[PDB]
Amino acid sequence: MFGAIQLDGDGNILQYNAAXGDITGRDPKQVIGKNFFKDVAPGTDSPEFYGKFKEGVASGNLNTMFEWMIPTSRGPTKVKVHMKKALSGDSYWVFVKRVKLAAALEHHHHHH
Numbered sequence: 001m002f003g004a005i006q007l008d009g010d011g012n013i014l015q016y017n018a019a020x021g022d023i024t025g026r027d028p029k030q031v032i033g034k035n036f037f038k039d040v041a042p043g044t045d046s047p048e049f050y051g052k053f054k055e056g057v058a059s060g061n062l063n064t065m066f067e068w069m070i071p072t073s074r075g076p077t078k079v080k081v082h083m084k085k086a087l088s089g090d091s092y093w094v095f096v097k098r099v100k101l102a103a104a105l106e107h108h109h110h111h112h
């Protein structure tokens with residue numbers, strides 16, 4: 001099971017998946033139509049995240065791969081976020097997969 005969020009150049013939700021909806025606890029249509037950075041995740045709205053998304057949009061190829069934190073009622077949840085421009089060239093998809101559990105060997109440096 002993987003998560004996929006289809007957003008537009010404006011930063012709105014166009015297509016939502018069920019997986020993400022279950023992991024987050026929000027319906028697809030409930031989030032679709034509104035801003036995922038303003039409505040869904042108002043806190044995520046930052047120059048490091050949103051700023052990067054916009055830049056890629058203007059260039060016509062947003063390629064970013066990193067990890068993000070998702071604070072929930074059951075505690076924080078570390079997931080790997082990846083934003084890649086659409087294939088048609090008129091949209092953007094965001095892949096979110098729950099990273100591995102507490103590993104032993106040194107990894108995920110520069111932990112926030």
Ligand SMILES: COc1cc(/C=C2\SC(=S)NC2=O)c(OC)cc1O
Binds near residue numbers: 025041068071
């Ligand atoms: C509700 O759905 C999502 C939420 C978040 C993040 C949040 S929510 C919050 S509060 N603080 C975050 O960083 C997310 O991050 C990649 C994906 C989702 O599909």
